[PDB]
């Protein structure tokens, strides 16, 4: 029968970034970055990925601040929320990209580039391999649950609007978003995936897994930074140093 989408969810969808514009902007930036460099100062694959991730985070901040509800918080509240979840949002973004755009044995990047598992299997160290292995496990789980765009945007809001952060001033708005987004997500899964009787619960149980992978990713990056591998003026490093 007909699909049903809660009104609230429609409102969340409206806040979504223009995916093709972000992709083209990030690719063009990286291509111009590399072209501006002489032969001996070209960025490595890692250096390029660091700049790519930085640009993705810029995009995430711009998504949040233009988002319904979030844009109504004072900057200090906005900062506390983003300080808490920035890496989880990066991970959720990456994971969802694989769920929608990914093909067996490869990884799809924000630039629209595709990277063969084998290329990674060979040139990546054990730390990154472990990270990617856990990310791939979550991707398989979500594909299996038929994770979709409507559920994706609800989870992004639930990750952003955390009641577990200290010294939040407008906690009532945060409570409100948690209450209403949870409700809309539940109504959505019950109506549209009625054969999967526990889909709602199953989706929520992915959240601590997202946190775990985000912590692992932060740790990997911090280590790379301590080795002097991360290019200068990295916004991810500023988020880490906070």
């Amino acid at each position: 029968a007909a699909a049903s989408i809660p009104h609230l969810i429609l409102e969340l969808l409206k806040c979504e970034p223009d995916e093709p514009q972000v992709q083209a902007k990030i690719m063009a930036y990286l291509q111009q970055e590399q072209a501006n460099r002489s032969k001996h100062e070209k960025l490595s694959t890692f250096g390029l990925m660091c700049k790519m991730a930085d640009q993705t985070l810029f995009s995430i901040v711009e998504w949040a601040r233009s988002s319904i509800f979030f844009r109504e918080l004072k900057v200090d509240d906005q900062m506390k929320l983003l300080q808490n979840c920035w890496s989880e949002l990066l991970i959720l973004d990456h994971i969802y990209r694989q769920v929608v755009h990914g093909k067996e044995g490869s990884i799809f990047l924000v630039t629209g580039q595709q990277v063969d598992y084998s290329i990674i299997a060979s040139q990546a160290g054990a730390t990154l391999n472990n990270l990617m292995s856990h990310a791939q496990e979550l991707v398989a789980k979500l594909r299996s649950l038929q994770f979709d765009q409507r559920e994706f945007v609800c989870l992004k809001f639930l990750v952003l609007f955390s009641l577990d952060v200290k010294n939040l001033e407008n906690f009532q708005l945060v409570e409100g978003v948690q209450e209403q987004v949870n409700a809309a997500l539940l109504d959505y899964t019950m109506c549209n995936y009625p054969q999967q009787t526990e889909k709602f619960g199953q989706l929520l149980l992915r959240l601590p897994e997202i946190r775990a992978i985000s912590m692992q990713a932060e740790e990997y990056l911090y280590y790379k930074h301590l080795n002097g591998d991360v290019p200068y003026n990295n916004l991810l490093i500023e988020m880490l140093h906070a």
Binding site: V61, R65, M79, Q83, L235, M239
Partner: peptide, 10 residues
């Protein structure tokens, strides 16, 4: 976090 403040407040 000065940069984060700026990105939001601008």
């Amino acid at each position: 976090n000065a940069l984060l403040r700026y990105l939001l407040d601008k």
